[PDB]
């Protein structure tokens, strides 16, 4: 919360200056508008014949004019003296936050055929939460229309939730489970994973560009770093062979040696000594034919 405090200090300096200047300006202008009003009446007590501007009042009027001038131009400059604080706020905002984050995974990827899918995903997410007003408003403008069979089970949820509104979350979870869905909407999980992953891809793509080695990670079909999302986000089983550091798909399945260690088939074949094979960890000599395929 360092950046927020840094901006908030500058915004506090601005609010205090504005309040002080406003109070000062109001008080000063009220003073003059009233003194000059009092100075007007004075002339009425004195005899009101024309050209009766004696020397006793001319100097007072000149002094009043000089004071009025000097005050107005001072209060006008005092406002311009505040311009530095706003610039400071802007500089702090620019320094403490990122303007362009175009570290896109694929530049020019979702052009026309993916907007419909994204709108469908958002509509499904809005159905899930019971926010059917927003969902219908989005369906009306986007153009897509959902079938009455895929919308009817959610109108009941909307009606019951509106009647209820503790218990709402429990009822929503139970209805979603009984309808044949997941615990959490896929959009929320994807957005959370993106929030976790983006301020690591951005940092690495920059440290890579910093070292003048932008052509290191040539492959464009795989992320350059591994992001940890927790044990709750493990849906599939990944082997990730220790020699090639690659996922063992088919046509190169994991193979168990005589020992308990596992080697990918390609790495096993490329470590052939013509006759005997040695496991990197334990010094046991085996043959390439003594290996059983592993199914995870």
């Amino acid at each position: 919360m360092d950046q927020c405090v840094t901006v908030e200090r500058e915004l506090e300096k601005v609010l205090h200056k504005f309040s002080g200047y406003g109070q000062l300006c109001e008080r000063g202008l009220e003073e003059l508008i009233d003194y000059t009003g009092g100075l007007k009446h004075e002339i009425l007590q004195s005899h009101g014949q024309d050209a009766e501007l004696s020397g006793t009042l001319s100097l007072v009027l000149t002094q009043c004019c000089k004071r009025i001038k000097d005050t107005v131009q001072k209060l006008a400059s005092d406002h311009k003296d505040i311009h530095s604080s706003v610039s400071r706020v802007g500089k702090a905002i620019d320094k403490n936050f990122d303007s362009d984050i175009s570290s896109v995974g694929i530049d020019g990827c979702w052009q026309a055929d993916s907007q419909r899918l994204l709108n469908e995903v958002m509509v499904e997410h809005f159905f899930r939460q019971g926010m059917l007003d927003v969902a219908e408003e989005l369906c009306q403008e986007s153009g897509l229309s959902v079938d009455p069979s895929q919308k009817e089970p959610f109108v009941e949820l909307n009606r019951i939730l509106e009647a209820l509104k503790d218990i709402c979350d429990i009822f929503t979870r139970d209805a979603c489970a009984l309808l044949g869905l997941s615990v959490e909407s896929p959009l929320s999980v994807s957005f959370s994973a993106g929030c976790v992953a983006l301020p690591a891809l951005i940092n690495i793509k920059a440290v890579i560009e910093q070292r003048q080695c932008t052509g290191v990670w040539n492959q464009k079909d795989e992320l350059p770093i591994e992001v940890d999302l927790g044990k709750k986000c493990w849906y599939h089983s990944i082997f990730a062979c220790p020699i090639l550091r690659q996922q063992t798909t088919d046509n190169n399945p994991p193979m168990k040696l005589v020992c308990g260690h596992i080697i990918s088939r390609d790495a096993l074949n490329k470590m052939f000594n013509g006759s005997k094979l040695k496991c990197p960890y334990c010094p046991m000599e085996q043959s390439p034919g003594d290996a059983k395929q592993i199914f995870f």
Binding site: C259, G260, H261, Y281, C282, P283
Partner: peptide, 8 residues
Amino acid sequence: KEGIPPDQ
């Protein structure tokens, strides 16, 4: 646990 001979 890992499966490494303790001699190496």
